[PDB]
Amino acid sequence: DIAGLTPCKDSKQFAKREKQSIKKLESSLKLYAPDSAPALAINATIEKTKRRFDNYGKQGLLCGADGLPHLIVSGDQRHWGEFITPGILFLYIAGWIGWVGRSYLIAIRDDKKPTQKEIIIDVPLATGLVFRGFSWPIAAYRELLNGELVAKDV
Amino acid sequence: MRDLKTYLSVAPVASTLWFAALAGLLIEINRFFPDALTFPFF
Amino acid sequence: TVAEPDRPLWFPGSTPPPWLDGSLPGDFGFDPLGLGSDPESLRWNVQAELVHSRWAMLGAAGIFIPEFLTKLGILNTPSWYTAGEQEYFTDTTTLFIVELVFIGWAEGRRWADILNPGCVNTDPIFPNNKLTGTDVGYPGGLWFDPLGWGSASPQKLKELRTKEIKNGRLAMLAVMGAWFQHIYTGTGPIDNLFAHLADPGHATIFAA
Amino acid sequence: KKGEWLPGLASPGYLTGSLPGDNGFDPLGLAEDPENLKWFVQAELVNGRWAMLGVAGMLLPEVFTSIGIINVPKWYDAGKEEYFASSSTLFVIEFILFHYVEIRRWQDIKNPGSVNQDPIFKQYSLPAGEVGYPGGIFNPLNFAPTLEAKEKEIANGRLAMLAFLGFIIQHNVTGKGPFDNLLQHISDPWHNTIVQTL
Ligand code: CLA
Ligand code: CLA
Ligand SMILES: CC(/C=C/C=C(C)/C=C/[C@@]12O[C@]1(C)C[C@@H](O)CC2(C)C)=C\C=C\C=C(C)\C=C\C=C(C)\C=C\[C@@]12O[C@]1(C)C[C@@H](O)CC2(C)C
Ligand SMILES: CC(/C=C/C=C(C)/C=C/[C@@]12O[C@]1(C)C[C@@H](O)CC2(C)C)=C\C=C\C=C(C)\C=C\C=C(C)\C=C\[C@@]12O[C@]1(C)C[C@@H](O)CC2(C)C
Ligand SMILES: CC1=C(/C=C/C(C)=C/C=C/C(C)=C\C=C\C=C(C)\C=C\C=C(C)\C=C\C2=C(C)CCCC2(C)C)C(C)(C)CCC1
Q: In 3D, which of C87, C83, C80, C95 has the Cα closest to residue C174?
A: C80
Pocket of ligand 2 (CB under 6 A): C 10, 20, 24, 26-31, 35-36, 45-46, 48-49, 52, 169, 172-173, 176
Subunit contact B34:A121, Cβ cutoff 8 A? no
- φ, ψ for residue A6 (rounded to 5)? -95, 150
Question: Quick check: C132 and C141 in contact, CB under 8 A?
Answer: yes
- The CATH number covering residue B2 comes to 1.20.5.510
Helix and strand numbers, DSSP H then E, in chain A = 6, 3
Please tell me what DSSP assigns to residue B9. T
- Give the SS3 label for residue D82: coil
d(Cα C78, Cα C192) in Å, to the nearest integer? 17
- Give the SS3 label for residue A63: strand
Instruction: For the beta carbon of residue A139, count every other beta carbon within 10 angstroms.
Output: 22
Question: Quick check: C67 and C84 in contact, CB under 8 A?
Answer: no
Question: Quick check: C157 and C66 in contact, CB under 8 A?
Answer: no
Give the 3-state secondary structure of chain C.
CCCCCCCCCCCCCCCCCCCCCCCCCCCCCCCCCCCCCCHHHHHHHHHHHHHHHHHHHHHHHHHHHHHHHHHCCCCCCCCCCHHHCCCCCCCCHHHHHHHHHHHHHHHHHHHHHHHCCCCCCCCCCCCCCCCCCCECCECCHHHHCCCCCCCCCCCCHHHHHHHHHHHHHHHHHHHHHHHHHHHHCCCCHHHHHHHHHHCCCCCCCCCC
d(Cα D155, Cα C97) in Å, to the nearest integer? 27
Superfamily per CATH, domain C39-198: Chlorophyll a/b binding protein domain (1.10.3460.10)
Strands (E), chain B: none
Q: What is the side-by-side strand order in the sheet with A6-7?
A: A6-7, A62-63, A69-70
d(Cα C149, Cα C132) in Å, to the nearest integer? 12
Please tell me what DSSP assigns to residue A120. B
Q: Which of chain D's residues have a Cβ under 8 Å away from the Cβ of A139?
A: 29-30
Measure Cα distances from D198 to C2, C102, D192 in Å: 58, 22, 11
Looking at residue D9, its amino acid is L
Q: In 3D, which of D4, D8, B2, D3 has the Cα closest to residue C114?
A: D8
Chains A and C touch (3+ CB pairs under 8 A): no
Instruction: For the beta carbon of residue D163, count every other beta carbon within 10 angstroms.
Output: 17
Give the 3-state secondary structure of C64-85.
HHHHHHHHCCCCCCCCCCHHHC
Residues after which chain A has a gap (C–N > 2.5 Å):
none
A121-128: long-range pairs with CB below 8 Å, 24+: A121/B9, A121/B10, A121/B11, A121/B14, A122/B9, A123/B9, A123/B14, A126/A100
d(Cα D156, Cα D52) in Å, to the nearest integer? 7
User: Best of A72, A73, A143 to mutate for ligand 5, by most ligand atoms within 8 A of CB?
Assistant: A73
Subunit contact C90:D8, Cβ cutoff 8 A? no
- The distance between the two most distant Cα atoms of chain D, rounded to a whole number of Å, is 65
In a domain, D75, yes or no: yes
Looking at residue C182, its amino acid is H
Measure Cα distances from B39 to A55, A74, A81, D172 in Å: 12, 16, 5, 18
Return the domain boundaries, chain C. Answer: 39-198
Instruction: For the beta carbon of residue A118, count every other beta carbon within 10 angstroms.
Output: 14
Instruction: Mention every residue, 6+ apart, whose C-beta is less than 8 A from residue D101.
Output: none
Measure Cα distances from A97 to A36, A94, A128, B15, B37 in Å: 47, 5, 14, 14, 24
Question: Quick check: A67 and A11 in contact, CB under 8 A?
Answer: yes
Q: In 3D, which of D38, D53, D32 has the Cα closest to residue D164?
A: D53
Please tell me what DSSP assigns to residue D139. -
Question: Quick check: D114 and D108 in contact, CB under 8 A?
Answer: yes
Q: In 3D, which of A6, A125, A25, A2 has the Cα closest to residue A66?
A: A6
Measured by CA distance, the residue closest to atom 30 of ligand 3 is C59
Q: Looking at chain B, which subunits does it touch, using at least 3 CB pairs closer than 8 Å as the criterion?
A: A, C
Q: Give how far D82 is from chain C: nearest CA, Å.
A: 43
d(Cα A5, Cα A74) in Å, to the nearest integer? 15
Is B2 labelled a binding residue? no
C87, C88, C89, C91: best mutation site toward chain D, by most D Cβ within 10 Å? C91
Measure Cα distances from D171 to D167, D174, D194 in Å: 6, 5, 12
- Give the SS3 label for residue A70: strand
Measure Cα distances from D163 to B31, C66, D17, D59 in Å: 36, 46, 26, 10
d(Cα A89, Cα A81) in Å, to the nearest integer? 11
Q: In 3D, which of C131, C109, D132, C40 has the Cα closest to residue B2?
A: C40
How would you classify residue A149: left for phi > 0, otherwise alpha for psi between -120 and 50, otherwise beta? alpha
d(Cα D22, Cα D147) in Å, to the nearest integer? 12
Instruction: Mention every residue, 6+ apart, whose C-beta is less than 8 A from residue A2.
Output: A62, A72, A76
What is the number of domains present in chain D?
Answer: 1
d(Cα C188, Cα C68) in Å, to the nearest integer? 10
Q: How far, in Å, is the centroid of ligand 2 from the Cα of D158?
A: 47
DSSP letters, D111-137, are STTTT-S-SSSSS------BTTB--GG
Determination technique used = cryo-EM
Helix and strand numbers, DSSP H then E, in chain B = 2, 0
Q: Give the rounded distance of the alpha carbon of C102 from its chain centre.
A: 20
The structure was resolved to a resolution in Å of 2.5
| Host domain of residue B29 | 1-42
d(Cα D99, Cα D119) in Å, to the nearest integer? 16
| Host domain of residue A41 | 1-154
d(Cα D43, Cα A52) in Å, to the nearest integer? 46
Question: Closest ligand 5 atom to the C-alpha of A95?
Answer: 29
Residue of D nearest to A133 (CA): D28
Instruction: Mention every residue, 6+ apart, whose C-beta is less than 8 A from residue A59.
Output: A81, B37, B38, B40
- φ, ψ for residue C99 (rounded to 5)? -60, -40
D1/C contact by beta carbon, under 8 A:
no
- φ, ψ for residue C180 (rounded to 5)? -75, -30
Question: Quick check: A76 and A70 in contact, CB under 8 A?
Answer: no
How would you classify residue A85: left for phi > 0, otherwise alpha for psi between -120 and 50, otherwise beta? alpha
What is the number of domains present in chain A?
Answer: 1
C101, C111, C119, C131: best mutation site toward chain D, by most D Cβ within 10 Å? C119
d(Cα D79, Cα C120) in Å, to the nearest integer? 50
In a domain, D70, yes or no: yes
Beta bridge partners of A7: A62
Task: Name the helix (H) or strand (E) containing A6.
Answer: strand A6-7
Looking at residue D57, its amino acid is G
d(Cα C68, Cα C178) in Å, to the nearest integer? 13
Cα three-residue angle D16-D19-D24, rounded to 5 degrees: 50
Give the 3-state secondary structure of D169-197.
HHHHHCCCCHHHHHHHHHCCHHHCCHHHH
How would you classify residue D74: left for phi > 0, otherwise alpha for psi between -120 and 50, otherwise beta? beta
Question: Quick check: C179 and C63 in contact, CB under 8 A?
Answer: no
Q: In 3D, which of D161, D128, D158 has the Cα closest to residue D20?
A: D158
d(Cα C98, Cα C104) in Å, to the nearest integer? 10
- The CATH number covering residue D144 comes to 1.10.3460.10
Looking at residue A81, its amino acid is G
Residue of B nearest to A85 (CA): B39
Measure Cα distances from D111 to B14, D39, D130 in Å: 51, 13, 11
| Host domain of residue D128 | 34-187
d(Cα C174, Cα C168) in Å, to the nearest integer? 10
Instruction: Mention every residue, 6+ apart, whose C-beta is less than 8 A from residue D77.
Output: none
C164/D contact by beta carbon, under 8 A:
no
Helix and strand numbers, DSSP H then E, in chain D = 6, 0
d(Cα A1, Cα A76) in Å, to the nearest integer? 13
Question: Quick check: D79 and D91 in contact, CB under 8 A?
Answer: no
D191/C contact by beta carbon, under 8 A:
yes
